[PDB]
Each structure stands twice: as structure tokens, then as C-alpha cells.
Amino acid sequence: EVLFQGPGADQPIDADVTVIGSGPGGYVAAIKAAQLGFKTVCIEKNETLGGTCLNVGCIPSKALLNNSHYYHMAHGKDFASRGIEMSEVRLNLDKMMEQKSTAVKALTGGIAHLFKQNKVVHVNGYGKITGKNQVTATKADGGTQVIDTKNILIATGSEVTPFPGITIDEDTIVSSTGALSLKKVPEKMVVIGAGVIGVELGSVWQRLGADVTAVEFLGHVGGVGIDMEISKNFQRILQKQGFKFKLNTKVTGATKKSDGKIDVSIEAASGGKAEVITCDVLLVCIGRRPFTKNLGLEELGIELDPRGRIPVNTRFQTKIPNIYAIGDVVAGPMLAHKAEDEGIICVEGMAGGAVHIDYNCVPSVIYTHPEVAWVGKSEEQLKEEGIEYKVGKFPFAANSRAKTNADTDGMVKILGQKSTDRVLGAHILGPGAEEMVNEAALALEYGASCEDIARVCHAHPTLSEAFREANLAASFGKSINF
Amino acid sequence: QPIDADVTVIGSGPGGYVAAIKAAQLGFKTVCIEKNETLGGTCLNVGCIPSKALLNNSHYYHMAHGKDFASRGIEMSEVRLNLDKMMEQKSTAVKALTGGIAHLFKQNKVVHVNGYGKITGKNQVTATKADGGTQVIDTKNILIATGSEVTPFPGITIDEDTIVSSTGALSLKKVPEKMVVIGAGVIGVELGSVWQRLGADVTAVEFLGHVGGVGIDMEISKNFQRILQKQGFKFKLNTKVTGATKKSDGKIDVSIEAASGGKAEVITCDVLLVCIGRRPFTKNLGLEELGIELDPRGRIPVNTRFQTKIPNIYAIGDVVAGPMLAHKAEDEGIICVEGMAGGAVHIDYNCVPSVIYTHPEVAWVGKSEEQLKEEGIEYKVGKFPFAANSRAKTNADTDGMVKILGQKSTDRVLGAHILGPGAEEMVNEAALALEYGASCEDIARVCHAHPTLSEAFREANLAASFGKSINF
Numbered sequence: 023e024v025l026f027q028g029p030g031a032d033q034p035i036d037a038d039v040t041v042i043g044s045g046p047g048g049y050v051a052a053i054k055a056a057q058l059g060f061k062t063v064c065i066e067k068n069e070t071l072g073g074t075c076l077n078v079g080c081i082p083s084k085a086l087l088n089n090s091h092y093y094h095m096a097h098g099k100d101f102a103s104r105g106i107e108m109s110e111v112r113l114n115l116d117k118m119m120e121q122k123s124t125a126v127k128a129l130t131g132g133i134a135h136l137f138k139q140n141k142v143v144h145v146n147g148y149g150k151i152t153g154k155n156q157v158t159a160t161k162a163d164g165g166t167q168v169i170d171t172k173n174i175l176i177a178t179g180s181e182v183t184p185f186p187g188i189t190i191d192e193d194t195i196v197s198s199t200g201a202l203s204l205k206k207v208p209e210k211m212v213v214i215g216a217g218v219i220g221v222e223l224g225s226v227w228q229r230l231g232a233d234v235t236a237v238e239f240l241g242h243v244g245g246v247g248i249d250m251e252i253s254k255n256f257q258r259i260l261q262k263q264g265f266k267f268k269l270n271t272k273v274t275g276a277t278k279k280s281d282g283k284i285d286v287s288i289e290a291a292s293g294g295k296a297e298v299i300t301c302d303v304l305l306v307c308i309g310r311r312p313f314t315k316n317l318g319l320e321e322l323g324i325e326l327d328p329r330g331r332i333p334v335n336t337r338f339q340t341k342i343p344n345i346y347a348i349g350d351v352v353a354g355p356m357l358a359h360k361a362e363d364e365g366i367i368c369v370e371g372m373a374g375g376a377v378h379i380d381y382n383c384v385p386s387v388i389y390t391h392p393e394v395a396w397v398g399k400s401e402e403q404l405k406e407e408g409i410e411y412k413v414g415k416f417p418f419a420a421n422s423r424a425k426t427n428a429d430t431d432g433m434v435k436i437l438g439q440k441s442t443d444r445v446l447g448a449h450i451l452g453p454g455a456e457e458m459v460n461e462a463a464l465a466l467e468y469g470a471s472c473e474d475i476a477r478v479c480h481a482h483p484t485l486s487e488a489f490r491e492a493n494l495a496a497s498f499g500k501s502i503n504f
Numbered sequence: 505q506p507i508d509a510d511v512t513v514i515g516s517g518p519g520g521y522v523a524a525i526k527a528a529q530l531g532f533k534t535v536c537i538e539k540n541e542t543l544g545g546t547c548l549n550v551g552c553i554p555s556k557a558l559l560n561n562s563h564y565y566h567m568a569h570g571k572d573f574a575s576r577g578i579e580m581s582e583v584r585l586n587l588d589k590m591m592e593q594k595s596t597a598v599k600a601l602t603g604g605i606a607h608l609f610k611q612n613k614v615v616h617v618n619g620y621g622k623i624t625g626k627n628q629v630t631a632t633k634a635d636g637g638t639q640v641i642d643t644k645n646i647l648i649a650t651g652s653e654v655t656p657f658p659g660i661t662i663d664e665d666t667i668v669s670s671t672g673a674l675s676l677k678k679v680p681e682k683m684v685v686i687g688a689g690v691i692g693v694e695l696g697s698v699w700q701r702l703g704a705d706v707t708a709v710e711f712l713g714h715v716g717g718v719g720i721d722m723e724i725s726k727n728f729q730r731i732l733q734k735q736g737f738k739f740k741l742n743t744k745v746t747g748a749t750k751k752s753d754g755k756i757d758v759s760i761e762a763a764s765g766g767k768a769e770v771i772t773c774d775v776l777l778v779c780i781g782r783r784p785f786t787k788n789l790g791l792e793e794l795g796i797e798l799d800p801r802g803r804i805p806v807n808t809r810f811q812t813k814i815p816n817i818y819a820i821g822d823v824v825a826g827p828m829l830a831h832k833a834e835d836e837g838i839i840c841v842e843g844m845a846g847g848a849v850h851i852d853y854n855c856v857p858s859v860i861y862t863h864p865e866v867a868w869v870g871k872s873e874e875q876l877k878e879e880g881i882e883y884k885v886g887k888f889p890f891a892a893n894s895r896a897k898t899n900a901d902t903d904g905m906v907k908i909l910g911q912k913s914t915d916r917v918l919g920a921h922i923l924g925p926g927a928e929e930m931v932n933e934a935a936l937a938l939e940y941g942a943s944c945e946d947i948a949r950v951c952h953a954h955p956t957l958s959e960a961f962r963e964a965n966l967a968a969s970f971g972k973s974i975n976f
């Protein structure tokens with residue numbers, strides 16, 4: 023109704039809060055603002071709501087990770103070892119992609135329903151800040167719509183970081199977006215970037231039959247902030263699965279050849295040992311960067327930081343005090359739940375509340391198998407900061423739930439403060455890290471000790487018992503079952 | 505010759521073997537007596553471990569054999585059950601973990617005595633071995649961890665052939681054409697679901713009007729039952745079993761009636777599983793000669809240090825009161841031994857979680873709605889369905905919900921109830937929250953990773969705290 027302002031709807035709007043972008047940060051901020059009593063508008067330029075995470079991000083990638091893992095379980099040794107015998111296991115890639123698209127479409131429609139349920143006005147168009155208290159939306163038909171608003175919340179998100187000299191065409195040279203919709207399993211695939219996204223998508227296609235190699239300029243996998251012991255052990259596990267890595271390696275160029283294949287030229291990051299690697303599909307995921315194109319920032323005088331982020335204060339105010347920014351467009355880990363939480367507390371602050379977020383309590387997850395997840399500080403951070411800490415480790419090989427499922431890679435590692443026993447970091451490599459890292463985030467919120475967690479009665483048999491036992495080891499020096 | 509010990513543990517189940525390890529780690533000279541051929545007690549040998557293994561394997565068989573994998577583009581011409589192989593995978597896990605306990609005993613210098621333990625004096629345990637030989641342990645303290653056994657059904661004799669307990673049901677040699685389960689508690693629903701998935705026509709008969717045993721939330725139980733019924737698991741609730749007859753042809757005639765009276769009928773099956781309960785096991789332990797009287801249900805009365813009326817003789821686990829669960833026995837074993845060493849002894853049974861490892865899973869900790877009503881507590885409710893959770897939607901596995909009960913005035917979390925995927929792992933975050941006295945607001949404001957199933961726990965708390973969630 024009046025809750026959707028698409029092409030042809032061009033009357034001026036008065037709002038209390040105007041959110042630019044409908045990703046995890048923006049759509050949650052919009053809902054929360056309306057729930058707080060603000061007259062709220064959310065502007066989105068794309069055909070669907072939900073931003074990067076829903077449309078080309080978390081959701082399609084997790085769907086393919088799930089499906090590709092199940093294909094591996096059926097097509098490999100796992101099901102046979104359980105007495106589940108199958109004549110011929112065949113991949114129907116079109117059908118697997120259909121399952122992914124169904125999940126995306128359902129959740130995109132969910133956001134639209136939530137906007138309507140909460141009476142958020144959805145303006146479909148390209149938003150540009152045209153005054154301290156005004157956003158102009160330009161729509162697909164060329165029409166414009168003015169929103170005069172008390173507050174503006176920039177949640178314009180991120181884009182793929184281009185590799186200079188390598189042209190992404192989402193055909194044979196793909197970004198994460200193209201890699202999520204390949205029409206056939208490539209015989210050989212090269213991934214530029216062994217960060218979270220690259221390892222996830224590489225593992226997907228490796229499970230489905232591709233020969234996969236990831237090239238990384240740095241000397242570890244898993245992106246920034248990951249614990250080095252965890253990263254090394256994770257890499258070793260992925261290599262045994264067949265995922266190959268060339269770390270400390272820079273890519274010097276890529277050439278599409280006549281036969282349709284791609285020659286990737288590489289050498290040691292410092293220089294030397296030049297070689298060429300050939301592939302059928304090249305995935306470029308060297309990073310993501312904040313997206314602020316045509317937002318009006320320069321005219322407003324809001325200068326960006328050297329990496330393209332909008333500088334904000336602890337209330338998420340830009341230098342113009344009624345203009346705010348959250349999510350992938352500002353500093354901090356580029357994660358959906360981070361954007362969501364910043365959006366909530368920002369609008370809570372607009373309503374007069376306190377604004378505080380502890381980025382040491384924001385978890386990171388890698389949804390491979392085994393999964394990786396961590397929250398708090400790594401050993402390297404504690405060392406850099408001069409913190410005196412102790413370590414507790416527990417392997418999943420000694421966990422009854424993991425052993426019974428014959429799924430026993432990895433360990434839980436707990437870092438605790440020597441004097442006070444306070445949990446400083448939790449790092450999980452193995453099955454179920456997704457859900458276990460959230461128990462750790464709750465503990466960190468309270469400043470809980472390793473002993474605190476060790477004395478919680480965790481259900482037996484569960485993967486979380488390994489978390490309990492790692493904390494027991496950190497607190498008292500020894501676990502029970504290892 | 506006799507062994508001199510500081511702590512002598514009778515039984516090597518979750519309670520006993522962990523207590524023994526902990527006692528040795530504290531410096532006690534520790535002996536653990538076990539009558540069975542392997543360590544690990546009920547949980548490892550005929551309990552948690554074999555049941556969870558078959559639950560996993562039969563679930564995966566269901567996914568491959570049914571609609572699920574096809575819907576994901578994983579196409580298979582012919583999916584065949586090899587029951588001998590599925591049982592072998594189960595036995596492999598059991599064997600590895602039983603040997604793991606033996607290794608941990610060796611690593612921690614626990615002395616393993618194989619035999620039937622009887623307390624023969626205030627400071628003496630005698631273990632009698634299968635051949636009749638004896639081993640005497642003179643000991644400062646005795647820790648009774650003798651566990652539980654299946655509760656028999658009067659008039660029905662279990663022979664582990666066609667009328668089985670959980671032990672026999674875990675090792676059937678073939679999928680029975682028709683199977684009747686007496687008792688729709690946790691064990692009965694788990695084992696019935698295993699065999700239903702593998703091809704058996706399964707019906708559970710329950711005297712009460714709900715599935716899932718004592719303490720489960722009624723709303724959760726009803727929604728859980730309807731999901732299982734749509735899978736093909738049939739239930740006769742409010743129904744009493746009047747008898748069972750082993751027949752000449754090898755089948756079983758089960759007589760039933762309405763629990764209140766009336767509607768008498770007979771049901772025939774190939775296998776009858778009797779799981780109406782479990783009871784503490786103290787046979788031939790020497791309690792009567794010591795003057796240690798049992799409570800009316802057969803449990804050993806103990807004080808807050810888990811001392812019996814003889815203060816150097818202790819009891820923990822399934823042989824004492826409280827929920828009959830492995831993690832409960834383990835924690836009691838640890839804190840009992842800590843108390844022997846002089847430390848504080850604390851366990852909050854309101855923070856001890858319960859899990860049902862079906863698919864969907866069920867897990868809860870704290871109080872149910874019925875419990876809060878009985879106690880006169882003024883509470884509020886927050887619910888969040890997995891249909892609205894992004895992680896569940898990505899796997900297309902969207903039954904169930906999280907339900908949070910909070911104290912109306914103070915926002916304190918009073919109970920957490922999970923029906924759906926990953927409940928078994930999610931309830932541990934809930935247990936930590938209850939131990940900490942968390943508020944619904946506390947949890948709502950913790951940054952949970954996206955997309956994860958735990959976000960539904962966050963959103964249910966938000967709904968309980970602020971009145972509304974974000975994504976529903």
C-alpha cells in the first residue's frame with residue numbers, strides 16, 4: 023500500500039528515521055526503529071531486500087555448503103560405513119542450485135512481510151543524501167521521491183574488491199556471486215584469496231568434484247584475526263580433504279586462453295619462483311570494501327577513511343550529528359550479525375538509550391566441515407598486548423558425540439587470564455563450532471571464568487562437552503576425558 | 505593381598521569413572537571396581553552411546569532413502585539398509601570409548617578391580633570375581649556409583665529375544681515388521697524412532713497423556729508428538745497395557761485398554777520393547793548389614809556432600825535422587841570427590857539439561873509452564889519458530905520453535921525449551937544462562953553469529969524481554 027513506494031510513487035515523505043540499505047544492518051535497524059515508535063523509511067535500490075547476506079552472501083553460501091557436504095557424505099565413505107548402501111550417487115547441480123534459490127526467495131519475502139507487519143515504509147530506489155535532513159530516491163523509471171527526515175542511517179554495505187588487471191565477468195572469471203551459481207562443476211578451479219569466503223566456496227566446489235587450489239598473499243588461511251594454531255591445523259585438515267593452498271604467493275596476472283581455460287601467473291610474495299597454474303574457473307575473492315557510491319558524502323563534507331569507510335563515533339554518528347552509519351560501510355569485522363547489532367544499538371541511541379558494543383564479543387564462523395569459530399582474542403593478540411594468559415585444549419577425538427558420529431577432527435582451545443581465570447578467547451575447530459561459539463559469546467558478555475563454564479552441567483553426549491572440558495583444562499590444568 | 509586405598513569407587517559408569525579420575529587427580533589413591541567386562545556403565549555400553557549412534561545412522565538412512573537428498577540434487581538409484589553394518593558402526597564407537605576409559609584410568613593411576621563389589625565393613629570393600637576369587641580393598645572412603653537397571657513391567661518377562669528392554673532393542677538382528685513400545689518416555693521415543701526410520705511399523709503405548717517423560721513442557725510435547733506422527737510413529741496415549749503373551753509362532757499379543765478404563769483391544773507385534781522406566785541398582789551391595797536404608801523408590805539417601813548415614817560412605821548418580829542422566833551423574837561424582845577433599849559441593853538440578861536425540865531434537869533446562877503454574881510464579885513467554893530462522897531455512901529443516909519462560913517482574917530466565925534442529929547443542933548455552941541467573945534481555949543483547957540456529961534462542965529471549973522479536 024503506502025508501505026511500498028516504488029516507481030510512480032513520488033510524493034514527498036516526512037520521516038523520523040531514513041535507513042539507506044536493507045541488508046542485515048539496515049533492515050534490522052528499520053524494524054527496530056519502527057518498534058521504538060519512529061516513523062521509519064527504508065530505501066533499497068535492488069529488486070529484493072536483505073542485502074549482500076541474503077542475496078549473494080551468507081544464505082546462498084551456507085545452503086551450498088550444507089548440500090555439498092551431504093553429497094560428500096553419500097558419494098564418499100561416510101554413508102557406506104553406516105550401512106547405507108547405494109548403487110550410484112549422482113550430482114544434479116541444477117537441483118542443488120534450486121534448493122539454494124528457494125531458501126533465498128523465502129527469506130527475501132520474509133523481510134518484506136516484516137516491514138509490512140512493522141509498518142516500515144519501503145522506498146524502492148537509489149538513495150542520495152541531498153541535505154542534512156533530506157534523502158532523494160531515484161527510481162527505475164527515472165522518477166524521484168524526496169524524504170525529509172530527522173535522522174539518516176547509512177547502511178549501504180559493501181562490494182567485491184576488484185583485482186586490477188583481472189576482469190570479473192561472472193562467466194569464467196567470477197566473484198563470490200558467480201561462484202554461487204556456476205552451471206557445472208569446473209574440472210579445475212583457482213581461488214585468489216584464502217580468506218573466509220574463499221575457503222568456503224573453494225570447499226563447496228572441491229566437494230562437488232573440482233580440483234581446487236587457493237592462492238594467498240599472506241601466510242595463513244582464514245582471514246584476519248584467526249588464531250594461528252587454529253589456522254594451521256585447519257589448513258592441514260583441508261589439505262587432507264584435497265583442498266590445495268599456495269600461501270605467501272602473489273598473482274601477477276591471468277589470461278583467458280583460446281581453449282577457454284585461464285592461465286594464472288604467480289610467484290612468491292617476496293619475489294621469485296615464478297610459475298603458471300591453469301584452471302577452468304578463476305574465483306576472485308581478495309576482499310570486500312565499503313560501498314558509498316553516489317550517496318552525496320562529498321557534498322556533505324563527510325570524508326572517508328583511507329579504506330573507504332565512513333568515520334563514526336561510539337554512537338555511530340558521522341561528523342553531521344543526525345547522520346549515522348553502521349555495518350559493512352564502517353570499521354570493524356564485515357559480518358552480518360555485527361551489522362545487525364550496530365543497527366539496533368544505533369537506533370536505540372536515537373531514542374535516548376545508551377550505545378555500547380564490545381567488538382571482542384563478536385564471533386566469527388567459517389562454515390566448512392570441519393567448521394571454525396572463535397570469539398574474543400587469539401594467542402597472537404594476547405601476546406601483542408602483553409596479557410598473561412593460560413591455555414586449555416581439548417580434542418574432538420576424545421568427545422563422545424564426535425566419536426560416535428565418527429566425525430573427530432579438531433579441538434577446542436580456551437585462552438584464560440592467568441590471575442583471574444577470566445575467559446579471554448575461545449577458538450573452535452571441528453563439528454558444531456557454529457552453535458558452540460554462541461555459548462562462548464554469552465560467557466564473555468558476563469566476564470565469566472573458565473571455571474564458571476567448566477562447572478556448567480553440559481548435556482552428555484554433546485559436542486559442547488568439548489568446550490566444557492577445554493575450559494576445565496584452562497582453569498585447573500587437566501581435563502577429565504583427555 | 506588386600507589393597508589399601510583412599511577412595512574406592514563401586515561402578516564405572518559416567519558417575520563412577522569420572523569420580524575415580526577426579527579423585528586420582530586430587531591425589532587420592534583411588535580404586536574403581538566394576539563387575540562388567542568393560543568400563544563405562546549403562547551410558548557407554550547399553551545407553552547413551554549406542555542409542556545416539558543408531559539415531560544418527562537411521563536418520564541419515566532416512567535422508568538418503570526418502571525425499572530429502574533427492575530434493576538437494578543428490579540422486580541415488582537404490583538405497584539399501586545393511587543392518588549388520590549399521591550395528592557394526594555402533595559397536596565400533598562403543599568399543600573405542602570403553603577402551604578410552606581404560607586408558608584414562610591408566611593415565612591417572614586409577615586401579616581397576618574387576619569383580620562384584622560388596623561393602624564388607626565401614627572401611628572395606630570386597631570384590632568377588634566371576635571364578636569366585638576375591639580381592640579385598642581396605643579404604644578410607646567408599647563411593648557408591650552402582651547406577652540403575654531397567655524397571656520390569658509386572659507380569660511381562662523380558663527375555664531380550666522377542667520381548668526386549670532397551671538393551672535388546674539396541675541390537676536387534678533384523679528390522680521387525682511390527683514393534684510395540686511400552687512407555688513413550690525419552691528412551692522409548694528415541695528407540696521407537698530408530699526402528700520406525702529403518703522400516704518397522706512402530707506404535708508406542710503410554711499410560712499418561714503426553715510423550716517425552718517427566719518435566720517436559722506440555723506445549724513442546726504436543727508439537728513434538730504431532731511431528732513424530734507425521735513421520736509415521738504411531739502413539740496410543742492414555743492407554744494401559746494389561747498383559748503380553750509370547751505366542752507359539754513367535755509373535756506377541758499385547759492387551760491394552762484406556763488408562764481410565766474401557767476400550768479393551770489386542771495388538772500383535774514381532775518385537776515388544778519394554779521401557780516404562782529405570783530404577784536404582786544396589787543389589788547385594790551390603791547396605792542392609794550396614795543399616796543404610798533405601799527410600800521408597802530404592803534410592804540411597806544422601807546429604808549435601810553425598811554422604812550416606814555412614815559419613816565416609818557416599819553415593820552419586822542413578823543410585824540417588826534427581827534426574828537419571830549421565831551428565832548429572834558425572835557432576836555429582838566430581839563434586840562429591842571435591843567435598844572429600846574439603847571443598848564446596850554444589851549442583852543445581854534446575855540447571856541440568858534434558859535432551860531427546862530424535863529428529864527434530866528436543867531439549868530443555870529449567871522449569872516448564874506447568875511447573876511455573878504449580879508454583880504460583882508469574883511468568884511471561886517468548887517464542888520464536890525455526891521457520892523464521894535463517895540457518896534452519898538454509899537447510900530446509902524448519903520444524904519447531906524455541907520457547908523461553910521469564911519471570912514477569914524481573915525478566916529472569918526461568919526455563920528454556922527447544923524443539924527443532926540442534927536443540928542438543930543449543931540447550932548448553934541455555935544452561936549457562938540459567939546458572940548465571942541471566943535475564944531475557946541479557947541474552948537478547950548478546951551478539952549471536954548469523955546464520956546460526958542459536959539466533960532463535962536470542963530472538964525468543966528478545967520476545968520475552970521486549971515483547972517482540974525482530975525476525976518474527
Ligand SMILES: Cc1cc2nc3c(=O)[nH]c(=O)nc-3n(C[C@H](O)[C@H](O)[C@H](O)COP(=O)(O)OP(=O)(O)OC[C@H]3O[C@@H](n4cnc5c(N)ncnc54)[C@H](O)[C@@H]3O)c2cc1C
Nearest residue numbers: 043045047067073074075079149179180349350356357358
Ligand atoms: C559470499 C559471502 C558469504 C558471506 N557469509 C557470511 C556469513 O556466513 N556470516 C556473516 O556474518 N557474514 C557473511 N558475509 C558478510 C555479510 O554478507 C555482510 O557482512 C553483511 O551483508 C553486511 O550487511 P550490511 O547491512 O552492512 O550491508 P549489505 O548486506 O551489503 O547491504 C547493503 C544494502 O544497501 C543497498 N544500497 C547501497 N547503497 C544504496 C543506496 N545509495 N540507495 C539504496 N540502497 C543502497 C545495497 O543494495 C544493499 O542491499 C558473507 C559475504 C559474502 C560475500
Ligand SMILES: Cc1cc2nc3c(=O)[nH]c(=O)nc-3n(C[C@H](O)[C@H](O)[C@H](O)COP(=O)(O)OP(=O)(O)OC[C@H]3O[C@@H](n4cnc5c(N)ncnc54)[C@H](O)[C@@H]3O)c2cc1C
Nearest residue numbers: 515517519539545546547551621651652821822828829830
Ligand atoms: C537406552 C538408554 C539411553 C540413554 N541415553 C541417555 C542420553 O542420551 N543422555 C543421558 O544423559 N543419559 C542417558 N541415559 C541414562 C544414562 O545411561 C544414565 O543416567 C547413566 O549411565 C548413569 O550413570 P551412573 O554412573 O550413575 O550409573 P551406570 O551408568 O548405570 O553405571 C553403574 C555401573 O556400576 C556397575 N555396578 C553396579 N553394581 C556393582 C557392584 N556391586 N560391583 C561392581 N560394579 C557394580 C554396573 O555394572 C555399571 O557399570 C540413557 C539410558 C538408557 C538405558
